[PDB]
Amino acid sequence: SDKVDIYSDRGKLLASDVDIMDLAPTRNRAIRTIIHDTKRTAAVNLGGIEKALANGRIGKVKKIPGKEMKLDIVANAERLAERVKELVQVNEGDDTTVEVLAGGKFLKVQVPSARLESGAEYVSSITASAAAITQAIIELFDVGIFDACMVKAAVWGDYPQTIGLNGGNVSSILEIPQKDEGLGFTLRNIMANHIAAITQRNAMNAAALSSILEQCGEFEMGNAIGMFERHQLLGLAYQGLNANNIVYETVKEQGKSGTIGTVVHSIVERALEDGVISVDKVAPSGYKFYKANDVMLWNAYAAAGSLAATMVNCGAARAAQCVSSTLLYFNDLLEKETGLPGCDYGKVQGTAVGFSFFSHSIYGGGGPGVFNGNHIVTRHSRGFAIPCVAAAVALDAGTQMFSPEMTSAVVGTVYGSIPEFREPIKTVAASL
Amino acid sequence: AYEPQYYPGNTSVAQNRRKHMSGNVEKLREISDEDLTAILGHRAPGSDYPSTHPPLAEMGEPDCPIREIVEPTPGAAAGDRIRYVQWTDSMYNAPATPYWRSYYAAINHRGVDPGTLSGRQIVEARERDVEVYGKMSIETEMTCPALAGLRGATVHGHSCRLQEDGVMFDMLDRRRLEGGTIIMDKDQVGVPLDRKVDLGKPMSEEEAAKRTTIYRVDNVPFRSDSEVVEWVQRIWELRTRYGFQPQ
Amino acid sequence: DREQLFKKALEIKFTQEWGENKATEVSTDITSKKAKYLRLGTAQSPRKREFEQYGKEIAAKRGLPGYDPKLHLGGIPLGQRQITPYVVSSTDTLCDGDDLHFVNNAAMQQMWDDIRRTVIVGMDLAHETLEKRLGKEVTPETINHYLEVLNHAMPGAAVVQEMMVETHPGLVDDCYVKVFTGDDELADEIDKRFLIDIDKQFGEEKAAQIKAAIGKTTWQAVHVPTIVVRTCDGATTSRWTAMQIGMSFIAAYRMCAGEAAVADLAYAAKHAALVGMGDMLPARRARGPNEPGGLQFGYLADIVQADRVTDDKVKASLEVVAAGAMLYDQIWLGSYMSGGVGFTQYATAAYTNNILDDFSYYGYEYAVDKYGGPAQAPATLETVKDIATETAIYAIEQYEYFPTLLEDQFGGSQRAAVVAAAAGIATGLATGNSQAGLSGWYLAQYLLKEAEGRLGFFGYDLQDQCGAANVFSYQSDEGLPLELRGPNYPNYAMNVGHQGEYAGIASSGHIGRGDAFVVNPLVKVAFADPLLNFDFTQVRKEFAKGAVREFDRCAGERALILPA
Amino acid sequence: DREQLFKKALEIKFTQEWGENKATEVSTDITSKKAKYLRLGTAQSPRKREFEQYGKEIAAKRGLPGYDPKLHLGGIPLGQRQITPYVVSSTDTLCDGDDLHFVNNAAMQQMWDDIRRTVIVGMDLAHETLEKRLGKEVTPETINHYLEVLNHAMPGAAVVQEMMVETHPGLVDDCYVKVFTGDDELADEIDKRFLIDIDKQFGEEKAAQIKAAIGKTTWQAVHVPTIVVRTCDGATTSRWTAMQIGMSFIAAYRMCAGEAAVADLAYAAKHAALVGMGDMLPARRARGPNEPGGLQFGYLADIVQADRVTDDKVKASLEVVAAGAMLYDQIWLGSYMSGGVGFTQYATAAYTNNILDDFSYYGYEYAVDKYGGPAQAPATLETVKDIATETAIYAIEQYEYFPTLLEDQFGGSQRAAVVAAAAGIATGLATGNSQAGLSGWYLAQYLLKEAEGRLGFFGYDLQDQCGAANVFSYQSDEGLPLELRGPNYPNYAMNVGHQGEYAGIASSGHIGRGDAFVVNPLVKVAFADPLLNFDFTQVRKEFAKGAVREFDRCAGERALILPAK
Ligand code: F43
Ligand SMILES: C[C@@H](OP(=O)(O)O)[C@H](NC(=O)CCCCCCS)C(=O)O
Numbered sequence A: 001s002d003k004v005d006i007y008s009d010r011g012k013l014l015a016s017d018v019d020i021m022d023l024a025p026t027r028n029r030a031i032r033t034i035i036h037d038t039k040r041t042a043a044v045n046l047g048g049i050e051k052a053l054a055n056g057r058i059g060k061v062k063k064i065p066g067k068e069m070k071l072d073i074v075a076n077a078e079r080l081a082e083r084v085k086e087l088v089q090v091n092e093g094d095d096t097t098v099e100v101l102a103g104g105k106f107l108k109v110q111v112p113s114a115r116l117e118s119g120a121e122y123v124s125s126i127t128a129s130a131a132a133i134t135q136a137i138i139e140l141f142d143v144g145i146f147d148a149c150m151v152k153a154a155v156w157g158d159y160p161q162t163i164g165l166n167g168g169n170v171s172s173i174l175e176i177p178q179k180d181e182g183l184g185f186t187l188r189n190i191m192a193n194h195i196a197a198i199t200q201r202n203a204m205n206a207a208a209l210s211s212i213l214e215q216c217g218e219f220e221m222g223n224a225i226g227m228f229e230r231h232q233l234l235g236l237a238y239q240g241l242n243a244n245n246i247v248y249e250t251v252k253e254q255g256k257s258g259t260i261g262t263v264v265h266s267i268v269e270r271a272l273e274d275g276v277i278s279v280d281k282v283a284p285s286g287y288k289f290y291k292a293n294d295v296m297l298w299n300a301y302a303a304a305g306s307l308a309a310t311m312v313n314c315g316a317a318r319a320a321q322c323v324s325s326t327l328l329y330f331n332d333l334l335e336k337e338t339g340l341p342g343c344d345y346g347k348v349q350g351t352a353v354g355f356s357f358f359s360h361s362i363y364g365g366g367g368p369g370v371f372n373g374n375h376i377v378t379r380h381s382r383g384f385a386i387p388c389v390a391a392a393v394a395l396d397a398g399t400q401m402f403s404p405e406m407t408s409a410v411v412g413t414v415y416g417s418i419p420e421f422r423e424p425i426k427t428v429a430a431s432l
Numbered sequence B: 001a002y003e004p005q006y007y008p009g010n011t012s013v014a015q016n017r018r019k020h021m022s023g024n025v026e027k028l029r030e031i032s033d034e035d036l037t038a039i040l041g042h043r044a045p046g047s048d049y050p051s052t053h054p055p056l057a058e059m060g061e062p063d064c065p066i067r068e069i070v071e072p073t074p075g076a077a078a079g080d081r082i083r084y085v086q087w088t089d090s091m092y093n094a095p096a097t098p099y100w101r102s103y104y105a106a107i108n109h110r111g112v113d114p115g116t117l118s119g120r121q122i123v124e125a126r127e128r129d130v131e132v133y134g135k136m137s138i139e140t141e142m143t144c145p146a147l148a149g150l151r152g153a154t155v156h157g158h159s160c161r162l163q164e165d166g167v168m169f170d171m172l173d174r175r176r177l178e179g180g181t182i183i184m185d186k187d188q189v190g191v192p193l194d195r196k197v198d199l200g201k202p203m204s205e206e207e208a209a210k211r212t213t214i215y216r217v218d219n220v221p222f223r224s225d226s227e228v229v230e231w232v233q234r235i236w237e238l239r240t241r242y243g244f245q246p247q
Numbered sequence C: 001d002r003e004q005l006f007k008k009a010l011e012i013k014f015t016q017e018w019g020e021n022k023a024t025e026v027s028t029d030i031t032s033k034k035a036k037y038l039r040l041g042t043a044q045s046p047r048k049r050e051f052e053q054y055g056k057e058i059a060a061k062r063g064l065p066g067y068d069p070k071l072h073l074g075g076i077p078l079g080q081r082q083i084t085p086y087v088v089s090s091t092d093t094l095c096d097g098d099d100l101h102f103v104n105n106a107a108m109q110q111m112w113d114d115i116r117r118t119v120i121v122g123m124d125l126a127h128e129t130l131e132k133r134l135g136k137e138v139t140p141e142t143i144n145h146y147l148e149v150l151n152h153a154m155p156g157a158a159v160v161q162e163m164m165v166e167t168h169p170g171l172v173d174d175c176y177v178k179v180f181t182g183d184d185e186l187a188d189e190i191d192k193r194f195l196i197d198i199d200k201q202f203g204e205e206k207a208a209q210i211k212a213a214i215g216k217t218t219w220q221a222v223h224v225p226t227i228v229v230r231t232c233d234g235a236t237t238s239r240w241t242a243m244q245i246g247m248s249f250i251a252a253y254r255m256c257a258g259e260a261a262v263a264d265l266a267y268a269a270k271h272a273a274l275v276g277m278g279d280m281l282p283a284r285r286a287r288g289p290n291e292p293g294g295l296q297f298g299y300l301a302d303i304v305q306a307d308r309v310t311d312d313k314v315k316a317s318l319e320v321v322a323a324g325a326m327l328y329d330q331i332w333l334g335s336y337m338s339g340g341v342g343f344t345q346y347a348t349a350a351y352t353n354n355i356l357d358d359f360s361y362y363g364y365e366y367a368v369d370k371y372g373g374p375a376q377a378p379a380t381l382e383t384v385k386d387i388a389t390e391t392a393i394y395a396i397e398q399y400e401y402f403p404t405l406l407e408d409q410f411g412g413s414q415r416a417a418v419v420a421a422a423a424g425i426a427t428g429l430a431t432g433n434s435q436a437g438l439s440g441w442y443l444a445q446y447l448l449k450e451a452e453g454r455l456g457f458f459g460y461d462l463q464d465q466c467g468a469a470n471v472f473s474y475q476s477d478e479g480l481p482l483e484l485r486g487p488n489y490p491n492y493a494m495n496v497g498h499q500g501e502y503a504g505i506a507s508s509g510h511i512g513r514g515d516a517f518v519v520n521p522l523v524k525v526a527f528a529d530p531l532l533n534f535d536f537t538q539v540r541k542e543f544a545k546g547a548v549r550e551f552d553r554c555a556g557e558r559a560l561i562l563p564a
Numbered sequence D: 001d002r003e004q005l006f007k008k009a010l011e012i013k014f015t016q017e018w019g020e021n022k023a024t025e026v027s028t029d030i031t032s033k034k035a036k037y038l039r040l041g042t043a044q045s046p047r048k049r050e051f052e053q054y055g056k057e058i059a060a061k062r063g064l065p066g067y068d069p070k071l072h073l074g075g076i077p078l079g080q081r082q083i084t085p086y087v088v089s090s091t092d093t094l095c096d097g098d099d100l101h102f103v104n105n106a107a108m109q110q111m112w113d114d115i116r117r118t119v120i121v122g123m124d125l126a127h128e129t130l131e132k133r134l135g136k137e138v139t140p141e142t143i144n145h146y147l148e149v150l151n152h153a154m155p156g157a158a159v160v161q162e163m164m165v166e167t168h169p170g171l172v173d174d175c176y177v178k179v180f181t182g183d184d185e186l187a188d189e190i191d192k193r194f195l196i197d198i199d200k201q202f203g204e205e206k207a208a209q210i211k212a213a214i215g216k217t218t219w220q221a222v223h224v225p226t227i228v229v230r231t232c233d234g235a236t237t238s239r240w241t242a243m244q245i246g247m248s249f250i251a252a253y254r255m256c257a258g259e260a261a262v263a264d265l266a267y268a269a270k271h272a273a274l275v276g277m278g279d280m281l282p283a284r285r286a287r288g289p290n291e292p293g294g295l296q297f298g299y300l301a302d303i304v305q306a307d308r309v310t311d312d313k314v315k316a317s318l319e320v321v322a323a324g325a326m327l328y329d330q331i332w333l334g335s336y337m338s339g340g341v342g343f344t345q346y347a348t349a350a351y352t353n354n355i356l357d358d359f360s361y362y363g364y365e366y367a368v369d370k371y372g373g374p375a376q377a378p379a380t381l382e383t384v385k386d387i388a389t390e391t392a393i394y395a396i397e398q399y400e401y402f403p404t405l406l407e408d409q410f411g412g413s414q415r416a417a418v419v420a421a422a423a424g425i426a427t428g429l430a431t432g433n434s435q436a437g438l439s440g441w442y443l444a445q446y447l448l449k450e451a452e453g454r455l456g457f458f459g460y461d462l463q464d465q466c467g468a469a470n471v472f473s474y475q476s477d478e479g480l481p482l483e484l485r486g487p488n489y490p491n492y493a494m495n496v497g498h499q500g501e502y503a504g505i506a507s508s509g510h511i512g513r514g515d516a517f518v519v520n521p522l523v524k525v526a527f528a529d530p531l532l533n534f535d536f537t538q539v540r541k542e543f544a545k546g547a548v549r550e551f552d553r554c555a556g557e558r559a560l561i562l563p564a565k
């Protein structure tokens, strides 16, 4: 049996003697509610619909001359929200919610559980919202048979010529299921910029929300069965939920003058003090090869260390780009210091090698904010890399072109308005 | 009670379309059972209808309430193989048009699988059932043996200019006007037969014009059957309106 | 009496000898319902004899046979009926139908390659990246230097590393990059060798409309090598483009050759400022971007450029139909989605013998006389019903007045595509609304079915029976303006004789209104370029050049690297 | 003392003049750490001068410039260091590195087209449909007639309809269909013109192994026209194939030309009895079937045929590496997934100057002496550690004994791909287990990093650091035998200097065991065909022919339909 104490984003005790099994995506009530709300909540961009209608525009560059319909949408957000609620709800008084945000520019729509229970995926959050706003606008402006197709294009974009609502104005924190690389990747296809915007650039909460979603993904992928359940839960608790305050206290201890290397030394000292590692054998030069007394717990200390090193290094530069090299050299130096494998047995370091390449070259990728657990560059680790990317993005003070303010204004506002998403550590600890 | 009306229009073309739909078609020629089997090319004339031979796992009749109330056709009850009858009809006033051969089959024959195309029209069914259909398709006024031809392959000819003798072109030469009568001496897929099948005389140009289900500007223009043009526009308008909002 | 525009072509292709078909013995009267069938077979056709001869050589060389006319069913070769040529509409070129098969026509292959190998990439976000991250100044001088570097690098040549091996320029001389901008001050300072001048290429009104839609933004019209997309695929294009844009920014602005800011330029070129020709397709007909299935009908209308150089509205719409019928039916449906002999004549029906021209000019002239002029007819179901019925019934009757017309467009799907395209295009030009045109197309299909008692092939009218209801539907996978529909619109994903005609209808409302573009002004400007191998202002003339083996701008050949 | 196999090539490419590079003035000693830098630039190279002159012609003709050596950074053209040629391994061909760029090499393009334009389609289910559903008899006579019809129709010629227009046979003479069967009684009755005779193409033991795996089943090896896949894509192939198979069954069996049973033949040809070269790819790198990303490493090993005609096990493995390094790095990663100048030399490192040959023969000879012979070494981590360390350290030291070797494979990723391929192939051949070979590859990567204090390019070792742990993992998206891995295996989806080498390692276990095939016996038989344009028994010889512009079996050209020159 494995127990942990959960500490807050500010290093304060929230829950004691917590069995890690009770933090699992399959058992923890707060994580199950976060996933339930992730699947049922969608964003309708009324501002985008207004401009699309007024200019006959679809997405960033398409424009059909002669189709302009300058309908007044944003100022009618509350009336439209009321009608959207009537259309999205299944029964009067059910769990449907429609809220106006950003001065009328956005609607947060939460479809009732009944739509998810009779569907196979989360996509009714998008389709019920898109159909509801299309119908509500057609009604409010008495749109005729010839012109309704332009209301349809303003909401749904190029769909069904495109697989999804390309160039439309209905979106979610999630992407369409067809974009998944494999089985169980839907909760992994969430930009690090979305996480950082949702959590208000609080680096601990950004790492926590990302770790929760990544581990829900690893569970759905089939990577947390049998002995691997303990493996992933130890990583979730120590890296994602500040178990035993290791992440916060390591960052505090190393915050003034620490580097990637001093964080490596702190983690090795702590693992040895806690009995996680011991000297296996001493070479003739005096170099000590260490052994892991508990391999999965050593992996979790290296996952916590990878995050603490990201916070110390990206935090010092106030620059997100340092995360790719931090994940690489924290684990490479950890192996050279101990003779033991780094986090995820080389897969955090490997992910960091390609991530560094694809965040500093001509070939693809971009800034840290565009990566996610479903991205071909950063999918390789079993949920231990993206939480560090989310924290690094949060810590950036303005070096990025493709920042959360550029890519995640809609998602950040809509999902950031939900407390469980803003404060995941507190929410998880309180549900125990 | 209900009296079917089938189709609008008041011209000879509309009247012929309702004749084909209702099965009120005149018998103009005779074909023997063995000559029909020979020209269809599915089995030797006079032989018994072969059966399907499905795997052991599909032999069992399921407990189904629909199977209990829908009587199998004679062909289905015997387990006949699915076979076909395919026709090509000239646009130069051949009595038949592809859609109306399919409506004739859908209304008057049980357990049929009709298919309409511009240059060919087919009916697939359990072999003995398809022969019952095939006999009516060739003996009645729905066929002229010169302007129409049974063609299971290489169908080209419906839209071609007629030959100087008034017969519709056939790349495989399965039937032709030979000494005052139409002779078919190959099966519907062009395999030479060991017999000559006499399909009788062609219709005159006047008879074909009076019996045809096709509209032509030089006979009965489509434009002249006002109710048919109106019916098309009505279906188009109502489909258009209900596709937007079904109310 | 109005003289039908196709009569001259029917006289030539049916009553004048072509090869050794003895046409004068078949019939000299284009109105005669009867013809003398000579059953000449292969002997009448120099083209089929060329194929037979190559088939003998191939069988002898390989010891494994190929083409043999006698392997046709029953041992009866093609040509039992008179083999006739086709007049490519609007031209004096007479050719065999085999000369219009995409495999045998280099102009057709080059048209698809010029689309496939093109993407448009914005410069503003890249320039903003250089300013924000490096504090670099961007000026017309730095842009012009960058464009010289880019045109050296884009075909596959090095600018940073030592000991690089490069593509042979002689194999990639069709590859280049031009720029255009809605910023007139910047346009006047760009090196003229690389500029697509919007004021010179478009009339005053259209240039103003393009500039207002584009704003003060700057774009690169990139055309990667034809040899690359032929060896690889359309999804290669945006990646090939981004790699050499990245190298050119590194060398031209003396960046570190691989720093964090370079990844922002890569994300901008590959995703944020990329404007490709089309998005990916779903699993059953899986393909990446820049394939014909992802090409929206409005994009094909903006690629074609006849409307930019002619005031004849019907002619401009039918050049779009010709490009679309060829690309969508012959290459896309006839090869990418099927293959073999394919669908040459399902497409040639829409660009030969001036037949679609006759029907479309008739319908449009009727609408101009009745409603006043282009884009003056009300966009209502009453107008659609009027124009589409008048045009469709006129077209239906022409096949009956002229038995040679019916024999030429022998397949019902050919008649359906042409009858309905004329009704749709006349309606779209008259109302200035392409959705009204689409409604007219479906009404024309229904009229033809009841008129001839037949329509197209077995599965021709799946989208037409679904059609009327889905024109103005706003339901999830039903509703969409025609300009944004394409070969992945569910009802349209499978069948010949519709897609190319829909591209013409998509163009029709916009041509009626005098619009500079249909759906993407960036696409319209990118293809208003005479340096492109295929002349997009004269689609039918180019197909005719390819048919007679005279198209001299075919790119991608490997003669330079093969034995002499 | 063992004479390193690459020394002769280093002497030729560095000490003998190539073009006007004045090689004898640079250095005449292949062991010297110093060289005289003459900074000759373009003037030393007839190939760069050819490119410069075409660049001037292009600029003059278009009024828009192209290639210009002086647009290299700083106005300093390529060739400040001596420009040297390459020896294509196992050949006497000496060529410029530009002659091995896929764009400039018709043999390389034709190799990819022959794979892209091929699918294998079963006949048994189609014959069963004809017998059970239509009551038609299938005999050797009907099959032979069907094959004549099929070879007329497949290139794009008509068999049922009147007034069809057809492809010019002269443009599609590379298109044909052959058949093979595990039913020996049927093999003796098929028309010999269309047969791939398994007994003639393979040795007695291998033919028996193929027949036991295939059973009494019959298959069509279809090769659609090169011009079609060049105009279209790989996903066209199975559809083009099915259309003409359908037409040929209609004509040869005198069916109704479009009845319900025809749809069963279509479903059989397109789906139930189809054996393509690879499945589709996910959204980010979306592509349909028959593209390089879907080609499993074992499929590339079964496409290559050197093991069928040579008993030299290392040579047969390295012909697989040459095909894979070219296809996967130059065409796939270097064009489909990127583009531009691309990745010629990241791939040439694995098929030039007999370098990978020296390292692989060294490792394999070491393992044969120690363990007894091929497939005799135990498949254990102890064996992998032994062979891979011995081979990797030997290879690492060769770059230090020969400064010219280090200058030739100047990029660390080139050294990594070759050092690790030799360790992996020697281990796979010795154990008869390709998974043991893969484990050896990752150990060699780690040794090279600590030895030189550097490994490959910025992102080279993502899959190698993930590698050791994922060799024997059984987790969802980690576990998989190497034979079934490919360019879509997550860790492998992005980077050069691994995929082609993995194809060689996939082959190594099976070549060590003397197996007839690696993963698909149908693929192995389909490509054991001398009528195919590319000679899959001699990959490196074919690349050499393309390099010197002498490859004479390039298909898909349009000279016949272009104005005369
Ligand atoms: C075997 C099918 C069923 C099927 O799935 N496809 C076929 C045949 C296929 C083959 C014929 C090639 C050959 O002769 O070997 C090809 C060329 C496709 C291919 N595999 O390359 C084709 N049809 Ni078809 N197919 C056509 C057509 C047609 C017209 C022909 C009617 C007539 O009176 O001639 C009818 C459909 C209809 O009745 O509406 C038709 C049917 C049929 N079509 C019937 C054969 C009819 C027959 O037995 O003669 N096609 C056309 O209507 C015009 C265009 C023509 C296509 C070739 C081109 O575009 O040039 C060809 C398109
Ligand atoms: C990462 C990904 O790019 P994006 O991040 O999606 O732009 C991907 N490119 C690649 O993997 C490039 C591989 C070839 C060039 C690098 C060779 S080491 C692709 O285009 O789908």
Ligand SMILES: O=S(=O)(O)CCS
Pocket: B117, C457, C458, C459, D258
């Ligand atoms: O006869 S079918 O309509 O199935 C195919 C025509 S190409």
Ligand SMILES: O=S(=O)(O)CCS
Pocket: A357, A360, A361, A362, C258, D457, D458, D459
């Ligand atoms: O310098 S990088 O490693 O990013 C690319 C080498 S091709």
Ligand SMILES: [K+]
Pocket: C229, C230, C231, C232, C233, D229, D230, D231, D232, D233
């Ligand atoms: K291609």
